[PDB]
Amino acid sequence: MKTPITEAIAAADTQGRFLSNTELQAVNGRFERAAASMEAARALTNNAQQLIDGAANAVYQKFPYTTQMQGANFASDSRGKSKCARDIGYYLRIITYSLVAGGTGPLDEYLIAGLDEINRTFDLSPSWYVEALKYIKANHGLSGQAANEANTYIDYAINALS
């Protein structure tokens, strides 16, 4: 899959040559960032349940009709609320995938591809998930560069919905 390391190796192999100092400079930039990336991925994975439930509740408070109107696509009953939390879990899960991989690869392949027609078919508003990702971004309890790494990929998923 497309990661900064496999990208550098692919460029070197295409020209049938060893990795250059510039490619080794780029891989070092990834290995430096990877510490913050791993801390963010560890935090989001550990606090998955609290972040998921808080994100769903933030969407319900923001768009109250999602818990009031009937219809299978809404979250008025227990089945809908559980589907919502499952969805938000899917988003956060693939976000940690990307934090581990050091690139958007997993988000592009596992989440964004076909996401627009899934949401369109089942009448799921993208602004719901944008709000859930906004909550996770403001409640992951990270600081410094680990917060910046998390925010980079959370914003990447937000922009894919907009």
Partner 1 sequence: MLDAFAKVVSQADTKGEFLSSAQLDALSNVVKDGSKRLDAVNRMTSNASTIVANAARSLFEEQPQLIQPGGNAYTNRRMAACLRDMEIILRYVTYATLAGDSSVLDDRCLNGLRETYQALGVPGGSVAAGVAKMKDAAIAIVNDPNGITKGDCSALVSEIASYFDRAAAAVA
Whether 134 contacts 59, CB under 8 Å: no
- Is 157 a binding residue for ligand CYC by CB under 6 A? The answer is no
Q: Near a copy of itself by CB under 8 A, which window of 39-47, 49-57, 76-84, 117-125?
A: 117-125
Provide φ and ψ at 54, rounded to 5°.
-65, -35
| Contact status: 19 vs ligand CYC (CB under 6 A) | no
Contact 16, 4 (CB under 8 A): no
Residues 95-134 that bind ligand CYC (CB under 6 A): 111, 115, 118, 122, 124, 128-129, 132
99: closest CA among 54, 28, 157, 27?
157
What x-and-dash track marks residues 51-90 binding partner 1 by CB under 8 A?
A: ---------------------xx-----------------
CA angle 2, 145, 154 (to 5 degrees): 55
Helix axes 78-101, 21-46, angle to 10 degrees: 150
Which residue from 58, 111, 132, 136 is in contact with partner 1, where contact means CB under 8 A? Answer: 111
* From 22, 61, 68, 123, residue interacting with partner 1 (rule: CB under 8 A): 123
- Residue 75's binding partner among a copy of itself, partner 1, ligand CYC, none (Cβ under 5 to 8 angstroms by kind) is ligand CYC
Size of the site for ligand CYC (CB under 6 A): 27
Q: Is the dihedral of CA 71, 74, 77, 82 positive or negative?
A: positive
Contact of 75 with 83, CB cutoff 8 Å: yes
Task: Give the ranges where 63-161 is alpha helix by DSSP (H).
Answer: 65-68, 78-101, 105-106, 115-121, 126-139, 144-161
8 Å CB contact between 83 and 28: no
Contact between 153 and ligand CYC per CB under 6 A: no
Nearer to ligand CYC, 47 or 148 (CB): 148
Interacting residues with partner 1 (CB under 8 A) = 1, 3, 5-6, 8-10, 12-13, 16-19, 24, 27-28, 31-32, 34-35, 38, 41-42, 45, 48, 72-73, 93-94, 96-97, 100-102, 105-106, 109-115, 117-118, 120-123, 143-144, 147-148, 152, 155
